[PDB]
């Protein structure tokens, strides 16, 4: 199955009491693996299997880089606010990551948001930056003047990020690469006369599930989001109404297994 490594950075100018001006969290797939912030000024594991497999040298070195990234991030944000002539608190976000697909293929990405809206998206193949407005297009011209920076990123996305993903996937193989199959049951009268059919799944991992209704697809399937159960499994459902005598059935696909409940 596709696996991913993602690092997020959140920066907040003029934060409230308590609210850190900087947070940086790392995820493999939907599991968090690492945390840093302007309060703890320390990089910590958010999974025991990271904690067990990376020596103190690791947390020591990356604490220091993150204290650095915190500094750089306060300045990039303070500058953007000058550029827009924005007073008061605003936010700056960065997400970087790579997918290792099953075909053995790879993807890499890096983007920034200002106030939760897309600002700069990197293209590692054309070594260029897509910008949304004037102030963004200005930051692009600077970043593209630096051939060596653009090449550093492309190499990091394509080589480093995938090497990290691979050893993280090993450190946490029992958590990240297990399958817990889903419980799939179908329970049924949505108003007097009309009947709905609910296809429900729970206790499953990984969270990627396909669920639909068919006849022997079907139009107007009400789908429910994949939600976390709190035990590290997920749950999800699909509902559907019945013209008051066609033969219907719920189809579910998870982690290589296909199910039909008539």
């Amino acid at each position: 199955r596709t696996h991913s490594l993602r690092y997020f950075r959140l920066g907040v100018s003029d934060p409230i009491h308590g609210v850190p001006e900087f947070i940086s969290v790392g995820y493999v797939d939907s599991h968090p693996i690492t945390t840093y912030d302007s309060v703890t000024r320390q990089k910590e594991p958010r999974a025991p299997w990271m904690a067990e497999n990376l020596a103190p040298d690791h947390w020591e070195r990356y604490t220091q880089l993150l204290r650095g990234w915190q500094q750089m991030f306060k300045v990039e944000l303070k500058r953007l606010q000058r550029h827009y002539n924005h007073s008061g608190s605003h936010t700056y976000q960065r997400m970087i990551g790579c997918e290792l697909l099953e075909d053995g293929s790879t993807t890499g990405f890096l983007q920034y948001a200002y106030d939760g809206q897309d600002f700069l998206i990197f293209n590692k193949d054309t070594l260029s930056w897509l910008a949304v407005d004037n102030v963004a297009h200005t930051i692009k011209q600077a970043w593209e003047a630096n051939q060596h920076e653009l090449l550093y990123q492309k190499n990091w996305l394509e080589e480093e990020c995938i090497a990290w993903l691979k050893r993280f996937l090993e450190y946490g193989k029992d958590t990240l690469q297990r399958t817990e199959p889903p419980l799939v049951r179908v329970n049924r009268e949505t108003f007097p006369g009309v009947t709905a059919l609910f296809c429900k799944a729970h206790g499953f991992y990984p969270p990627e599930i396909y669920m639909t209704w068919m006849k022997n697809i079907v139009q107007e399937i009400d789908y429910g989001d994949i939600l976390p159960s709190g035990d590290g499994t997920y749950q999800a459902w699909a509902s559907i109404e019945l013209d008051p005598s066609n033969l219907y059935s719920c189809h579910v696909e998870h982690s290589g297994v296909h199910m039909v409940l008539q």
Partner: antibody
Amino acid sequence: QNIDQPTEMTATEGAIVQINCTYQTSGFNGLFWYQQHAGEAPTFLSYNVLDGLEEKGRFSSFLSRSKGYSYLLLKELQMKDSASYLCAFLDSNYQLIWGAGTKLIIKP
Amino acid sequence: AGVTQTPKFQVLKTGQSMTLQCAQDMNHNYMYWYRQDPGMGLRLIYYSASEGTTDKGEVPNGYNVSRSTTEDFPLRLLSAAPSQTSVYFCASSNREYSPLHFGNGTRLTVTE
């Protein structure tokens, strides 16, 4: 986490010298060459991180990520190219690992 | 502009204390202290990813640093030893991955 470059190299004024640099690492964030004149501060020459060649004038830098190999190529040598040439790479942790340096002697 | 390092030369008696200054006007986030010695690469003593943080390099023993400001990264020799006879270079870089700008060095000799 080792790096090798030759101690000393000597070449005739007007000719060509290729300074080799090899490096074993599990992780790479780029290779640098710095120039250091006797009694002076090392100064930035070249950054390579993808495979291939870069050229700024009489100076070229090549990198093979796979072969873990770099060369600094100096054409049309001048007496002023007498200096130490330092190679360095960033590892996975962004630690800058320095070679022992190559002293380039130019014969007039 | 660049990195200014003082002094260029110092002799110390064994056990004396010594502050090497080093400053940059370039807004660099990283500053570094290296010693250069015949037959080996530069060896990192300490470094600093930003004002308010510092960390050991490969040869921290015998040295301390401070980074109260972006500008300044002083290196203090605590108790001077013969083995510290060396040439000291402090450097700055915009980022963990950008080119180092070096100062013009300190030639330092410790005699009993």
